[PDB]
């Protein structure tokens, strides 16, 4: 017999933020971005 | 954990103009692994 177990977790997080303000007239523009990529893998084998 | 963030400000007077900008980014990664293996054998021979 052999009994085999594997566990695996992967996480990624990314953020971007930008804001601009001009005065002359007056103007503003802004943006926000957020991100995640995530993976889980579990794999097993058993022989008898 | 990784972060890069910048802030910029400018005002100019001669007319008056000003610009201010703030920019920030965060990056994080986490990975977790686990594994288990066990093996065994028996032979028995009897006469």
């Amino acid at each position: 017999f052999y009994n085999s177990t594997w566990s695996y977790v992967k996480h990624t997080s990314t953020e971007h933020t930008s804001s601009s303000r001009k005065r002359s007239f007056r103007s503003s523009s802004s943006s926000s971005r957020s991100y995640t990529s995530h993976t889980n893998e579990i794999h097993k084998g058993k022989s008898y | 954990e990784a972060k890069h963030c910048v802030r910029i400000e400018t005002k100019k007077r001669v007319a008056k103009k000003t610009k201010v900008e703030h920019r920030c980014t965060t990056n994080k990664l986490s990975e977790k692994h686990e594994g288990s293996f066990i093996q065994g054998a028996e032979k028995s021979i009897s006469l």
Binding site: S4, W6 | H33, G35, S36, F37
Partner: peptide, 29 residues
């Protein structure tokens, strides 16, 4: 380690047809 992440290869053909040959199998590390 989870050594079977690096799977074992298939065995060699036996070194001789009779009288105790040997065969081996490395991993794909």
């Amino acid at each position: 380690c989870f050594c079977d992440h690096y799977a074992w290869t298939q065995w060699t053909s036996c070194s001789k047809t009779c009288n105790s040959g040997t065969q081996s199998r490395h991993r794909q590390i």
